[PDB]
Structure 1
Amino acid sequence: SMITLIGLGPMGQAMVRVLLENGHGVTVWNRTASRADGVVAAGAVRVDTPADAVAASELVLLSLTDYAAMYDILGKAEEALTGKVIVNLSSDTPEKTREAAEWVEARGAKFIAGGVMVPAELVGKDEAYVFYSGPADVFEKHREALALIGRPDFLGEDVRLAQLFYQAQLDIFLNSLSAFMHASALVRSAGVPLEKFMPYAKDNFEMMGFYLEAAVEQIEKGDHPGDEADVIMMGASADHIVQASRDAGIDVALPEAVKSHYDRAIAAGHGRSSWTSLFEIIKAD
């Protein structure tokens, strides 16, 4: 049961290993031949060329930093893409994802977009899930295999959907990392150790589920009551974090961006509305 995988970053590697562990034969190629050494030891079969990698399997998985990478690699293997199934598990733009769907299918391949929503350490484990979008019939044919990487959430036949859901998750995630480090940087400025603050940050993030249901209701109904907490008070909070950041001499870009949401809401007259009203100035009309 030979499946190909191209791109042997942590993810590519962790995926190749799960495919090998569950009986499948796995052909690999990577720009840096020597990164494959570990998985080749485990049972994978390295090959000289990207075309050889594509020719080896029906199913071809890509784990690459961006879609530009798909073009650099598959560009040296076009004649062999015919009859094949590209599953691209790379981050890039939804718009660039569709543009990619069209190029691979013009070269005669079926294209599915995927987004893996776990670190490599948890690929193949219980917490693992993967956004997928594109041909439902082709996805079904290879579901059993892809299901090993993590729980497949098929979103629809619009190839952009998985990428859009991936960018959306990482929007929150990269924000939470940057926010965490920013808040930590504020406390370390006054000489507090990170280990004394981290438990509070943990609770902070773990408590987010409490707010999210009321938030979705308020946002979809355009109903933003400030009774519990208004944009004037939370705008002031944003102003304080910015000014504390300048006082401490840490980064101001991230808190100035949060303040800008409150500033635009205030300008739009949502002073007395719920913080959910920020959605009105964030969204596309």
Structure 2
Amino acid sequence: TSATVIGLGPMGQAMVRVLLEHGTAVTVWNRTKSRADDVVARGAVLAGTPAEALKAAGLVILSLTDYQAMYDVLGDAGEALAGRVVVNLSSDTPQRTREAAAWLAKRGATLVAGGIMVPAPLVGAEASYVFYSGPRDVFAEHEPVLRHIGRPEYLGEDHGLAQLFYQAELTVFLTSLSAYLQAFALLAAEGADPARLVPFAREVSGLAASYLDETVSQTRARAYPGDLSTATMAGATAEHILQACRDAGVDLALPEAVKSQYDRAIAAGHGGDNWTSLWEVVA
């Protein structure tokens, strides 16, 4: 089989190296042509233009920073797009993903939206999985090649779905990473060693994740029993974190935001309810 990969960031390069090793014939284009040097040594073919890349295969995988990069790179391709399957594995909003399907469908191209849920060194590892959404039959046709990148997770016909799941996962992932930096900054600022927090940070992350079922259960019921923990109690800590960050001279954005959820839930009369009562503020 032949595949085209447009975008040779670490994710693009990992996908090329995987599809090559599984004996696919891979055509690449990149904005920065030099970054193709590695995958070309491994027998990827370098296209001169995006439109050239599109002509080299019926399966076109984009790994770009956002969906605007797709418009920037393919806006000029005209009839090179007709009959192509565009598998867009780029971050963007659900609404821009849905717009992109219409856009591509006017130029006679099919969108399959995806999101790869592992970093580049795990692409095509056992851990690797990818959300997909858009037309099932079209996806099914290329699933056999795409699967080398990771366990497909087909979500449905709405192109926005894979993107919604990706953005929901990355809210968890990026916000957690920011919370690690926040926790480390608070220690470092008070002269303690962030290294000493690590084992306890793992513990508390594992603990946080053990609340997922109760969060889903209570929020879908809009029922927030406060017997084990009140928004008043949790909100007090949110203020203690903010004040400790003010005292230590570290950034306030993240703890301000968390405190704001508790303050609005308390002002709204959920002081005696579970922390899940913040759903009444966030949702």
Tell me by how many angstroms 1:78 deviates.
2.1
Aligned to 1:144: 144
Residue 222 of structure 2 aligns to which amino acid in structure 1?
A: G
Tell me by how many angstroms 1:216 deviates.
1.3
Tell me by how many angstroms 1:253 deviates.
0.7
SS of structure 2 residue aligned to 1:34 = helix
Tell me by how many angstroms 1:267 deviates.
1.2
Q: Which segment drifts farther, 235-244 or 195-204?
A: 195-204
- Deviations 1:170-194 (Å, cap 9, x if unpaired)? 1111101110001000000111112
SS of structure 2 residue aligned to 1:269 = helix
1:59-98 matches, cutoff 5 A: 59-98=59-98
Cα distance between partner residues in 2 of 1:122 and 1:59: 22
- Do structure 1's residue 247 and structure 2's residue 247 form an aligned pair? yes
- Deviations 1:142-163 (Å, cap 9, x if unpaired)? 0011111111111100000000
- Do structure 1's residue 231 and structure 2's residue 196 form an aligned pair? no
C-alpha RMSD over aligned residues: 0.7
Tell me by how many angstroms 1:165 deviates.
0.5
TM-score by length of 1: 0.98
Aligned to 1:100: 100
- Deviations 1:239-269 (Å, cap 9, x if unpaired)? 0000000000001010000000001100110
Cα distance between partner residues in 2 of 1:159 and 1:230: 39
SS of structure 2 residue aligned to 1:148 = coil
Aligned to 1:182: 182
TM-score by length of 2: 0.99
Quote the sequence identity (%). Answer: 60
Aligned to 1:3: 3
Q: Which runs of 4+ in 1 moved over 3 A?
A: none
Aligned to 1:171: 171
1:146-225 matches, cutoff 5 A: 146-225=146-225
Tell me by how many angstroms 1:207 deviates.
2.4
Residue 118 of structure 2 aligns to which amino acid in structure 1?
A: V
SS of structure 2 residue aligned to 1:60 = strand
Residue 237 of structure 2 aligns to which amino acid in structure 1?
A: S
SS of structure 1 residue aligned to 2:15 = helix
Cα distance between partner residues in 2 of 1:238 and 1:113: 38
Tell me by how many angstroms 1:203 deviates.
1.4
Aligned to 2:115: 115
Cα distance between partner residues in 1 of 2:194 and 2:186: 10
Residue 113 of structure 1 aligns to which amino acid in structure 2?
A: A
Aligned to 1:22: 22
Aligned to 1:125: 125
SS of structure 1 residue aligned to 2:270 = coil
Cα distance between partner residues in 1 of 2:87 and 2:275: 39
Please list every run of 5 or more consecutive structure 2 residues that lacks an aligned counterpart in the other structure: none
Aligned to 2:277: 277
Residue 90 of structure 1 aligns to which amino acid in structure 2?
A: S
